[PDB]
């Protein structure tokens, strides 16, 4: 376990390290492409089918 993995037995414990993230969000990255759906909605609805 000390060589295939880490988990070095120091002072009387196997020690874990950081296993987390930041979770960023923009939610206006879709604002280019959600506009592409809305233009497509009025596209097919206005065309003589």
């Amino acid at each position: 376990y000390a060589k295939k993995r880490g988990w070095v037995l120091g002072p009387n414990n196997y020690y874990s390290f950081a296993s987390q993230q930041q979770k960023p969000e923009d939610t206006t990255i879709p604002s280019t492409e959600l506009a592409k759906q809305v233009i497509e909605y009025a596209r097919q609805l206005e065309m003589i089918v």
Binding site: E25, D26, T27, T28, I39, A42, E46
Partner: protein, 286 residues
């Protein structure tokens, strides 16, 4: 203050004929005429116009002519034929206003106490709203101007009347138009909108590239009044504004989802009603 004017569409056309009268010179001859309107309210009305002789040089823009005698008699005729109407101001046809354009106002403030100009444009290379109007005040500055006198922007719009909507929109039949088309004007309106956004930014950087380097007065006008424009600039995608698009756009998505759910069922009625009428008129014919 006046805070808007209302311009009937009989003028914007009774100017352009006078530009078409003397327009054989071609190169440059500014049209100046007399504007007629109503002493209405804080809001003001514009009804009629007529012309006046005017010429002016290229250098030393202080040699210019308004025939007062022509202005007294012809307005005396229009006062004679129309007692409701009186003078409100003047106009000129120049695309950008000139340096001469303040002494013309300083003449005819003795006719109307608030004499208002209207700039029109015979050639709106801008595809946006033409024919904007100004008014002169005094804004004496920290610099020590004895009289800081420059015109102020006043908003404006095209008026309407029941008889003139008949005659104008009859003449609109020479071209095609979609006023009845829903959402076809709307998609153009953001196209006509953002074209106006790009046009004002290409103009402002042309002013800003000159005043940066080489030649322009660097003065305590716009350069910090335009700094306040940068101060607003909302930070759109941040912490709590995300919960304004995901709590309110999906409200308006359900109403669209409702409206599609009925529109499909409505078009499904027209199937069975046609398919019954198709084969049952066939099976009785044969």
């Amino acid at each position: 203050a006046v805070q808007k004017v209302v311009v009937h569409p009989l003028v914007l056309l009774s100017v352009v004929d006078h530009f078409n009268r003397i327009g054989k010179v071609g190169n440059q001859k500014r049209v100046v005429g007399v504007l007629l309107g109503s002493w209405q309210k804080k809001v003001l009305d514009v009804s009629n116009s007529f012309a006046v002789p005017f010429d002016e040089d290229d250098k030393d823009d202080s040699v210019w002519f308004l025939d007062h005698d022509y202005l007294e008699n012809m307005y005396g005729m229009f006062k004679k034929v129309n007692a409701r109407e009186r003078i409100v101001g003047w106009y000129h046809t120049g695309p950008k206003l000139h340096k001469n354009d303040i002494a013309i106002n300083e003449l005819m403030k003795r006719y109307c106490p608030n004499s208002v100009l209207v700039i029109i444009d015979v050639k709106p290379k801008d595809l946006g709203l033409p024919t904007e109007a100004y008014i002169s005040v005094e804004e004496v500055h920290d610099d020590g101007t004895p009289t800081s006198k420059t015109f102020e922007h006043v908003t404006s719009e095209i008026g309407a009347e029941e008889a003139e909507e008949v005659g104008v929109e009859h003449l609109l039949r020479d071209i095609k138009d979609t006023t009845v088309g829903t959402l076809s004007q709307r998609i153009t309106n953001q196209v006509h909108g953002l074209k106006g956004l790009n046009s004002k930014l290409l103009d402002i950087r042309s002013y800003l590239e000159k005043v940066a380097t080489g030649k322009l007065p660097i003065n305590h006008q716009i350069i910090y009044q335009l700094q306040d424009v940068f101060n607003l600039l909302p930070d759109v995608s941040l912490q709590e504004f995300v919960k304004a698009f995901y709590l309110k756009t999906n409200d308006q998505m359900v109403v669209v989802y409702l409206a599609s759910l009925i529109r499909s069922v409505v078009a499904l009625h027209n199937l069975i009603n046609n398919k019954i009428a198709n084969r049952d008129a066939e099976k009785k014919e044969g």
